[PDB]
């Protein structure tokens, strides 16, 4: 549901992990407590992969992916590419992307159906995203920011956006993304909402300093909320 | 949780001592003189403060 945990002592989970519908990715330098958050709740449905991208531990911001495909940047080595093609299932396709804009997570905000990309991305990538992910690509900015992946968490049900966002432009994106959108803060007043948390259909994991009113806004738009063991025995 | 039969067993080694005023040494509670030589075997002893 709405579980909270943290990597080593940092609240942000979207930097250090990439959660999709059919798989999950985590960085290698984690404690036993951080790994046990995903293992206890995902179970054996989707494969959890320990990986690194380009010699880094920031794999949630370097990669871009959904149910059908994964996009990795150029500096990902052949040893790390061969490891991912084994642990992930045969349904997903992994493709290395030649970019000037290396960090694909900040650039691409995507789901099963509709993706928003950075406006200065080139045309040879727009052909590549739509054929790998199988997603319509729409060049658009969140009202004041070009980094659409960092400031806008998105799932299949809903999407949380940047707090300083006009209502007149949320109705533009909801017309475009075909999902309802709510603005808010995560991690006790951090405007970077896509890097603080992750989301798929059946799970959404955020930081430990996310307050209780903030957690209500998250699970509401994503619609992941829903007892005999509790009772009175005196 | 401490079962105060055992708390009285441990306080004899920790709390029920006496302290010399000059050299701050830990002394037995029935003593009259400090056993060290760097305080000159002084006899100004105080009980150790209880919690």
């Amino acid at each position: 549901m709405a579980t909270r945990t943290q990597f080593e002592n940092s609240n942000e989970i979207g930097v250090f992990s990439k959660l999709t519908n059919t798989y999950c990715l985590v960085a290698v330098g984690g404690s036993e407590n951080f790994y046990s958050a995903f293992e206890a709740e995902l179970g054996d449905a989707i494969p959890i992969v320990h990986t690194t991208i380009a010699g880094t531990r920031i794999i949630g911001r370097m990669t871009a992916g959904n149910r059908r495909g994964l996009l990795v940047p150029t500096q990902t080595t052949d040893q790390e590419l061969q490891h991912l093609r084994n642990s992930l299932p045969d349904s997903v396709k992994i493709q290395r992307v030649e970019e000037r804009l290396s960090a694909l997570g900040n650039v691409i905000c995507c789901n099963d159906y509709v993706a928003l990309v950075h406006p200065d991305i080139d045309r040879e990538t727009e052909e590549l995203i739509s054929d790998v992910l199988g997603v319509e690509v729409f060049r658009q900015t969140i009202s004041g920011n070009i980094l659409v992946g960092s400031y806008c968490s998105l799932s299949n049900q809903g999407g949380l956006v940047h707090p300083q966002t006009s209502v007149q432009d949320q109705e533009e994106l909801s017309s475009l993304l075909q999902v309802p959108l709510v603005a808010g803060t995560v991690n006790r007043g951090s405007s970077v909402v896509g890097a603080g948390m992750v989301v798929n259909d059946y799970l959404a994991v955020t930081g430990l300093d996310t307050t209780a009113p903030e957690l209500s806004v998250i699970e509401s738009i994503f619609r992941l909320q829903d007892e005999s063991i509790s009772g009175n025995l005196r | 949780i401490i079962e105060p039969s055992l708390k009285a067993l441990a306080s004899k080694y920790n709390c029920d001592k006496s302290v010399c005023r000059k050299c701050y040494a830990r002394l037995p509670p029935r003593a009259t003189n400090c056993r060290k030589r760097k305080c000159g075997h002084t006899n100004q002893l105080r009980p150790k403060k209880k919690l």
Partner: protein, 96 residues
């Protein structure tokens, strides 16, 4: 008067004198501790240093950031022909 701004000493005092060595073959001052359960083997070897070259290896050190990662590094190649025994010498222990 005092030094007015403290600073550590330049140089090391356990390496005095800086005088020229007695021979180009430096002596071995000390050999490892004898363990008489093990079979007979030598304790050192003589060789001639040739040069340096560069190496690449997969670093295997868990909990590091460069775990399962390639690193380059500098190695030294010492030319090592086989060495032939021509005698033995036994030392007794005296109080001097």
């Amino acid at each position: 008067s005092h030094r007015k701004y403290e600073a550590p000493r330049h140089g090391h005092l356990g390496f005095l004198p800086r005088k020229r060595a007695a021979s180009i073959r430096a002596r071995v001052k000390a050999f490892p501790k004898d363990d008489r359960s093990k079979p007979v083997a030598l304790t050192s070897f003589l060789g001639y240093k040739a040069g340096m070259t560069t190496i690449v290896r997969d670093l295997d050190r868990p909990g590091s950031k460069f775990h399962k990662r390639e690193v380059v590094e500098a190695v030294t190649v010492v030319d090592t022909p086989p060495v032939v025994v021509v005698g033995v010498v036994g030392y007794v222990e005296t109080p001097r």
